[PDB]
Amino acid sequence: GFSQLEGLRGHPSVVRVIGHRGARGVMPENTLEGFAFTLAAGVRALEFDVVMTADGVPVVTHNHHLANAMTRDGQGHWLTGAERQVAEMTYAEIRALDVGGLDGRTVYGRRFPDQAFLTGIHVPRLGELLDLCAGYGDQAPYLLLELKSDPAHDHAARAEMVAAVLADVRRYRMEPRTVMHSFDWALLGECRRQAPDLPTSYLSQLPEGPDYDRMTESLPQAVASAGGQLWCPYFLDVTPELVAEAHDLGLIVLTWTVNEPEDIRRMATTGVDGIVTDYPGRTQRILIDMGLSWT
Amino acid sequence: GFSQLEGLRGHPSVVRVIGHRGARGVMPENTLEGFAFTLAAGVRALEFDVVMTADGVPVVTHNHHLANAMTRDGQGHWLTGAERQVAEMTYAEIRALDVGGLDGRTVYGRRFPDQAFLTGIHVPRLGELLDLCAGYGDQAPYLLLELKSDPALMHDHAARAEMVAAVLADVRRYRMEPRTVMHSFDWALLGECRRQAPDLPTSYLSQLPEGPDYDRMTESLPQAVASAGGQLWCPYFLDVTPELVAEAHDLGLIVLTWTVNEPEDIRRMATTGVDGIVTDYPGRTQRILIDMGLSWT
Ligand SMILES: [Cl-]
Ligand SMILES: [Cl-]
Ligand SMILES: [Cl-]
Ligand SMILES: [Cl-]
Ligand SMILES: [Cl-]
Ligand SMILES: [Mg+2]
Ligand SMILES: [Mg+2]
Ligand SMILES: [Mg+2]
């Protein structure tokens, strides 16, 4: 089947640990430095986000607009004013910016007060991250590659994005580690069209994507029927019964983004295959305490 | 004229950040893995501990006995029973153990619940740490090298001198003199360091019971340290007051306080005017300094 799933499939005593944006709680998110830390912490699977620049470069960042809370200019000053769209910026323009730390006077910055504060850190190209990962050979981590389609609907552009992402995955020969992951289920269908050998992972989050109000099948049922290999529900949306239903349909379930100790502990007991977390060490330690492992 | 002090001296815009055992809140303490992480997190100074094995190897571990909360046997199970004395073990025997994580059931484990949990990590030789540090070249960190004497040698003056010589042989082999500071609670040992290596500054740890006879002494800690010939005074943070810090600065000393982890303590120490803060949480400390408009370079 899909050998990429071997790093994400759980067992009775095994719950996988996936580093969210690398390890946002410890290092600046979606940075090569953060990803290197995460792998050095023994984490075997990484989640990260891919968006496209104006000049067709896949880059690793979560927001479609560069957030003032996260971004400094070449002078070292936090950006102010309009948050600029990644889609309207060339790579070169993005590269001049610094995403090495957070502004501790902002609500977002105050969420992650223990994160290191680095300077002169660039938004990476997807190719840079893949090249890094490929160098580790058989120890390359599993990649939950979150595709973020430009919300400003053009199928041509969406197909171009998927094609650009795949060109990088293939260039670095990361097919055996790569999972295409998204809230955009139509985009996942396009992933499957251009890359039938890469598994697809379906993100879900209940309100308060599918029409959560009108749908008559369960989320796991909908994912299986769409052709997905993974169902990734927000952790407040998980029950042991829903996990069991997904497993009966042959799906792998990874939940996110679980950071509080009581929430990690609770999720580990539900049977989820793995936990996406901003705090991989914290998660490792809770799993060990419960007699579980992640390798 | 000690060039090593350039990375430990503060100034109006700067409070130095010293990584305690690397970054014990994030990575297993006193490990090459944790030291590399610390340097990748932009920390420019490291504190770590050195103890002698039975076969005369300076190794990087915090105490003269091995703690059950951070040590696993050759099968992977936590040590139980009486602590083992490092001076009575060969380096090979020590190396057979695993120090890659902490036992989360324990008091000590609960102190650092977010530390990564690694397997297959052994206690490194001092030489290995110095090789790693020297590899960064001009970006090599400043080193606050804590000599941890074993009270069993307290009447073995030759053995104590041998410890100092062994540590220095390593420092010299890796050309780390320009970054090394000799640091200890054992003030007599610091006298021996100065005699064997007058080129390396000496740093005097203190911690009040509430070393010297804290109940008997009549001069201040800063005065006692300046009089002993030290360049740094490193008091435990609960013992620090701004008046004691200014008294120390007036005597020409650098003041590094330790081990400061809670946000309100980090902030209060920055405000006393200390030259630097030794912390288990360098990122937390960095963020508080940035919030205060300060930096660590
Ligand atoms: Cl493919
Ligand atoms: Cl978030
Ligand atoms: Cl420095
Ligand atoms: Cl205990
Ligand atoms: Cl301690
Ligand atoms: Mg994401
Ligand atoms: Mg300026
Ligand atoms: Mg120490």
TrEMBL record, chain B:
SUPFAM superfamilies: PLC-like phosphodiesterases (SSF51695)
Entries under Pfam families matching the protein: GDPD
GO biological process terms held by the UniProt record: lipid metabolic process
Keywords: Metal-binding
InterPro entries linked to this entry: GP_PDE_dom, PLC-like_Pdiesterase_TIM-brl
Nucleus listed as a keyword: no
Positions annotated to bind Mg(2+) 2: 77
Binding site for Mg(2+) 1: 47, 49, 146
Entry's Gene Ontology molecular function annotations: metal ion binding; phosphoric diester hydrolase activity
Classification via Gene3D superfamilies: Phosphatidylinositol (PI) phosphodiesterase
Limits of the GP-PDE domain: 15-289
Protein name (Swiss-Prot/TrEMBL): Glycerophosphoryl diester phosphodiesterase, putative
Organism this protein belongs to: Ruegeria pomeroyi (strain ATCC 700808 / DSM 15171 / DSS-3) (Silicibacter pomeroyi)
